[PDB]
Structure formats: structure tokens, C-alpha cells
Amino acid sequence: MARADDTALPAATGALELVRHLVAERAELPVEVLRDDSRFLDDLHMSSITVGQLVNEAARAMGLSAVAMPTNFATATVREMAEALEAREREAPHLEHHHHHH
């Protein structure tokens, strides 16, 4: 009603929903209840090690590689992680990879 994004994906999927989704599910909660200002520790309660676990899942979907964990998340929020990921893909090189076994 106020924004175009709104809960869940904006149109098809939206990188924003990808991060929030992976985070929400990793926090033992739905993506519809995931707050945009929910820290990866204050609320989501995701240790530095836990964050990297879900962060790797996002990069894979966004089609990244080295983007895995752009910066500290212990003090970041879903909006920051989602924005950082969406930013990279928004202007990333012509590189790609799979990397299995994990």
C-alpha cells in the first residue's frame, strides 16, 4: 500500500525475497513474518558461522561465487544482506561456477 515491493517477492522472485526467505527459514520462522530490520543476531539470532551457512545458499541462487559473505553480518540486517547481494548481481562480471560437495 505504501511501497511496490510489499511482503514476499515483488514480481517474479526479487533478490530481496531470496535473502529474507533464506534468513527467515534459517531463523525457524516464515518469510512473511521476517522483518526488514531484523538483525542476523538481535532477532534472527544467527551466529557468524550460521549466517555464512545461509549466505552461501543465497549467492548460489543469485548466480554468484566469490560474493559469498560480502561483509560482516553479525551487525547487519536482512535489508543489508539482500541489498549487498542484489547490488553484486546487478553489476557482476561474466563469470559463473557450480561448486558441489558441501
Sequence-distant (≥ 6) Cβ neighbours of residue 64 within 8 angstroms: 85, 88, 89, 92
Residue 92 in grid coordinates: 557482476
Of 53, 67, 56, nearest in space to 95 by CA: 67
List the CATH number of the domain containing 61: 1.10.1200.10
Of 73, 83, 81, nearest in space to 50 by CA: 73
Return the half-sphere exposure (C-beta side, CA atoms, 13 A cut-off) of residue 59.
20
Number of domains observed in the structure of the chain: 1
Containing domain of residue 71, as a range? Answer: 1-102
Q: Which amino acid is at 13?
A: T
